[PDB]
Symmetry: none
Subunit: 158 residues, 2 copies
């Protein structure tokens, strides 16, 4: 990854089910009733679902249409709060596409319908806005894989 | 009108017949139990929903507390000693938001204040953080206080 668009930003940590990598992990136990954040390098011997930390990734990989195929967990920067979204959770995608795009470089926060997620600037310097289509929570944000510096927001309607 | 579904609050030391949550690995393991636990954690017992201030000394928690927001699929664990910030919503008339248990960026509107002449002012989130609780201010009817976690 070359465009490190979250660098020097305090953002939440997001963990996706079965995305095997060397990131931090969280074990979802007891059919959703226990959450265990695993120590870096701790050997997990249990039988729950392991969710792995992703940062620069395409959330559409974990979605069939607009429903999540994999469990997702968000660990907020406060270091006290978490949100756990089971597979089957319906998410709204809000793309921010234009000549030049200025997105909010964050995710995991509440918004009202109409909140401005991005500003789109034309080759002539004129502006358009990408506003939240609903009130809810922005769950994640990523660069559109084939469109350098164009982004998409993933939202959970309230 | 109605707000969000009512949160579940669990507090340490309140040995009762309610639902329990065990806190292990010093914050990093949270186990909701139903109906026999002998682990090495600390049990938090469900309490009847009430102001969070009944478990704080000024701005700081006095006991380990966990809040589960079922509408929101979200929980927060507040170890004893955790400091919260208060955002009062006070005015001739106050129109607060009717939900909490979510992260907000700075500037998110928590209340509209209205003067006796009908002019408006807004109480916004002063910091980015988590809105974990809100209640009516005890001696001030129809006035409210939001409690946040600064991140």
């Amino acid at each position: 990854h070359e465009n490190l668009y979250f660098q020097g930003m305090k953002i939440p940590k997001i963990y996706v089910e079965g995305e095997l990598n060397d990131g931090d992990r969280v074990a979802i136990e007891k059919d959703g009733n226990a959450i265990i954040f695993l120590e870096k390098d701790e050997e997990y011997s249990g039988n729950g679902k392991l969710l792995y930390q992703v940062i620069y990734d395409d959330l559409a990989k974990y979605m069939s249409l607009d429903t999540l195929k994999k469990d997702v967990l968000i660990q907020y920067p406060d270091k006290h709060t978490l949100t756990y979204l089971k597979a089957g959770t319906k998410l709204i995608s809000v793309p921010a596409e234009g000549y030049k795009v200025y997105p909010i470089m964050d995710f995991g926060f509440r918004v009202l319908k109409g909140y401005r997620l991005a500003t789109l600037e034309s080759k002539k310097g004129d502006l358009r806005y990408v506003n939240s289509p609903v009130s809810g929570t922005v769950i994640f944000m990523n660069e559109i894989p084939s469109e350098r510096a164009n982004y998409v927001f993933y939202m959970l309607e309230e």
